[PDB]
Design a protein around this ligand. Structure first.
Ligand SMILES: NC(=O)C1=CN([C@@H]2O[C@H](COP(=O)(O)OP(=O)(O)OC[C@H]3O[C@@H](n4cnc5c(N)ncnc54)[C@H](OP(=O)(O)O)[C@@H]3O)[C@@H](O)[C@H]2O)C=CC1
Length: 288
């Protein structure tokens, strides 16, 4: 329903998500849709970008409100007849000193980081146009958390045949295991945030197969990635790189040139793919 291509980013009123929309408004040939769960916060962000010559469109979106997601679909369907670029950026993390009980932190982090991300995908993947790109912003914390789980769990996540059903099952188990205070007897990592990123990353793998299994001819590319340690409300003030820089790999994955057929279903960090599970080569100078 449109010959104009369109890109969309979740949780983009601030942080990396915001940075990503800026770069797209600059490097993407078509409309860029900035979304946010709060309209005021979201429109303000749009206004700020207009002050740079950029002109992105706005639309409300809370990836936790299934009804909010469906409305976006409607918007897209009618306005563009589909969607070309999707970047699942939105997320939360409970840091140190936050009183929230552990099992609750588990449940809420999972609820939006995995569940939310998945509900956006199941609803928008059908709308991705051929030559379309999908980027899921994960974290290397997922890999760290992956290596802390028991070899039995690691094997299940690293599987080539794991299903979307089994993945959703493992994520849910993790939450039940923490409420019942046994997740360690079950060989799980203590990192609720990390475990959710595992899910996002494995989910991307699974999605990559389904796409080539159900739409091989559509040349769609999908990958998960880590933007690095960045200065945001989530990253903290010590973070070495700024949002402008952090949005580099994600944007790169979003603009992969037409007909590339790779990378696909890969974990990308700093524009380079990284074997799933393989720990990070180095790490920034520590300034405690
Ligand atoms: N910062 C870092 O060092 C790293 C970040 N990442 C990943 O990058 C992504 C963005 O990180 P960062 O920029 O620091 O994040 P921020 O915490 O600065 O921003 C997160 C954004 O997601 C939004 N959001 C949270 N929950 C929801 C929801 N339910 N529906 C819609 N939007 C929501 C926030 O909304 P609102 O403003 O209204 O709260 C916000 O716009 C995340 O996926 C994160 O895990 C990965 C590795 C490192």
């Amino acid at each position: 329903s449109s010959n104009t291509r369109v890109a969309l980013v979740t949780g983009a009123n601030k942080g990396i998500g915001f940075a990503i929309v800026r770069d797209l408004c600059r490097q993407f040939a078509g409309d860029v849709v900035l979304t946010a769960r709060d309209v005021a916060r979201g429109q303000a962000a749009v206004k700020q970008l207009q002050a740079e010559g950029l002109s992105p469109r706005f639309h409300q979106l809370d990836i936790i409100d299934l009804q909010s997601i469906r409305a976006l679909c409607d918007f897209l369907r009618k306005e563009y007849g589909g969607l070309d670029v999707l970047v699942n950026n939105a997320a939360i993390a409970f840091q140190l000193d936050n009183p929230t009980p552990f099992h609750i932190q588990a449940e809420l982090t999972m609820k939006t980081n995995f569940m939310g991300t998945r509900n956006v995908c199941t609803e928008l993947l059908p709308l991705i146009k051929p030559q379309g790109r999908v980027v899921n912003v994960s974290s290397t914390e997922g890999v760290r958390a992956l290596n802390e789980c028991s070899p039995e769990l690691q094997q299940k996540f690293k599987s080539e045949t794991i299903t979307e059903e089994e993945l959703v099952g493992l994520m849910n188990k993790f939450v039940e295991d923490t409420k019942n205070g046994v997740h360690r007897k079950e060989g799980w990592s203590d990192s609720t945030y990390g475990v959710t990123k595992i899910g996002v990353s494995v989910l991307s793998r699974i999605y990559a197969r389904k796409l080539r299994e159900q739409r091989a001819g559509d040349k769609i590319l999908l990958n998960a990635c880590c933007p690095g340690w960045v200065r945001t409300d989530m990253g903290g003030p010590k973070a070495p790189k700024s949002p402008e820089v952090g949005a580099e790999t994600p944007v790169y994955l979003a603009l992969l040139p037409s007909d590339a057929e790779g990378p696909h279903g890969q974990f990308v960090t700093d524009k380079k793919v990284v074997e799933w599970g393989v720990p990070p080569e180095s790490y920034p100078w520590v300034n405690a």
